[PDB]
Symmetry: C2
Subunit: 275 residues, 2 copies
């Protein structure tokens, strides 16, 4: 509840002293990567899958994480014990690091931060969320270091993109799924390698005997689906009740979406049992 400590570069630091010098490249240029996952019953969920994503994110930016995976795993568990929590949100950050010339990475900085479990985590509400579609369309100016994060609500809480006015494109925040009248589930394949919750839910759906097609989604498919939902670390499986002017069902969670919520909780229990 009270979080006492974070970790910077392997050292446990009181939250009140956790600071970086302003030469850090994430401060100066926004150069950095992150990951985020929950812990329950004293164990980070699907931890190996998250750590694998973190090492891959780092590689995409040519940043070397200063510890190997087993060492990072150890640091995370140590931090949970130092903060005395069994339920938490954990954020990993790897910055571009301190640079003598304000541009050259010479040593990334590694942060492990810890939070309460998000109050809304896996809310699993019966009432679906309302989102908009938006064109995928600053025209590349060096002065703006900042994922877009500038929506302005627009009676909605979230959105999905439309590209070339014909293809659905997922935001960075969540993976997007449709359930068709025939119980075919459809999702993009573009973030196949990157979605952790996405894979657990696809696996569960397949085990339940649903077909899951992974392909580009045409805008017109939104008019043909019975259900729509999001997956992410914090949401779990989250019903979407309305897109623009389209209500799905009566706006409440659909049959397959609900079953996938239960099966996701099942995948969480099964993981926890191996721990």
């Amino acid at each position: 509840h009270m979080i006492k400590y974070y970790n910077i570069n392997g050292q446990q630091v009181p939250v009140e002293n956790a600071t970086l010098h302003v030469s850090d490249l994430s401060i100066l240029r926004g150069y950095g990567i992150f990951d985020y996952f929950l812990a329950r019953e004293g164990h980070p969920l699907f931890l190996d899958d998250y750590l694998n994503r973190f090492y891959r994110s780092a590689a995409e930016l040519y940043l070397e994480i200063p510890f190997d995976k087993a060492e990072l795993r150890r640091q995370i568990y140590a931090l949970l014990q130092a903060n005395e929590v069994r339920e938490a949100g954990i954020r990993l950050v790897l910055t571009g690091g301190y640079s003598p010339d304000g541009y050259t990475p010479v040593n990334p900085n590694l942060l492990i931060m810890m939070y309460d479990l998000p109050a809304s985590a896996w809310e699993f509400s019966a009432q679906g969320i309302k989102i908009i579609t938006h064109p995928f369309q600053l025209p590349e100016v060096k002065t703006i270091n900042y994922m877009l994060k500038t929506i302005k609500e627009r009676g909605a809480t979230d959105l999905i993109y439309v590209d070339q006015g014909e293809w659905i494109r997922e935001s960075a925040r969540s993976n997007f799924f449709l359930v068709m009248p025939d119980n075919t589930i459809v999702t993009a394949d573009e973030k196949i390698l990157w979605g952790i919750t996405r894979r657990q839910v696809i696996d569960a759906a397949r085990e339940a005997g649903y077909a899951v097609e992974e392909r580009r989604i045409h805008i017109t498919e939104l008019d043909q689906a019975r259900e729509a939902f999001f997956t992410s670390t914090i949401k779990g499986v989250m019903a979407i009740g309305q897109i623009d002017d389209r209500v799905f069902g009566d706006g409440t969670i659909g049959k397959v979406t609900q079953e996938l919520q239960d099966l996701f909780v099942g995948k969480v229990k099964a993981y926890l049992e191996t721990c």
Copy 2:
């Protein structure tokens, strides 16, 4: 030379103590804006044009700068005097700021940092730089907070983009110009509002009696130009001697590019005279 102080949120801080808490959104998500300009003879160049850009960058991200322009101007001049320098590089940073929930901006942090004048600033070498073309083409994953900054050299020091395999698109670092056999100068208009050096050089070229067309540039135009150059804060006017397998002239600075270098220095002197 020795830089003694930076400025954080209006307070002059010894460099060794200039730090931010890790809850800063630029650290966590890369959310932030910046500007950068030189000072000569104790005056930041074209300062009003830079400050105007900084306020506009901030508006694009819905961040409010905590001081008005006259106050920020005062802080910059004070910092120059505290560091006792007449020549400098000045970097402004406005982060997303400290956030109680690791996501909501509630108070951007403002940094003013100071450097030596870059050794290479306005080198104005006779030998032009060598660059490549590259497709404008991470498919939008939340985990990577980071302007691209991941080129891998590729016998070059810089690049320009090609979009739809037909249109030249400038990187974020520099504005791109061609000089045609008839002494027509051609540059994009896409960053009309954002390029500070770009405007000084366009103005100078027009005053010299050159026509400057501001429009999209077709890839094939690279095969028709006599000269090519970059403008930016640090480069001034910089000759490009080779693009991919195309040498421009004999690789050394062209006639109009050289004249534009002199005229840019003239615009700098003229500014300094008003100060």
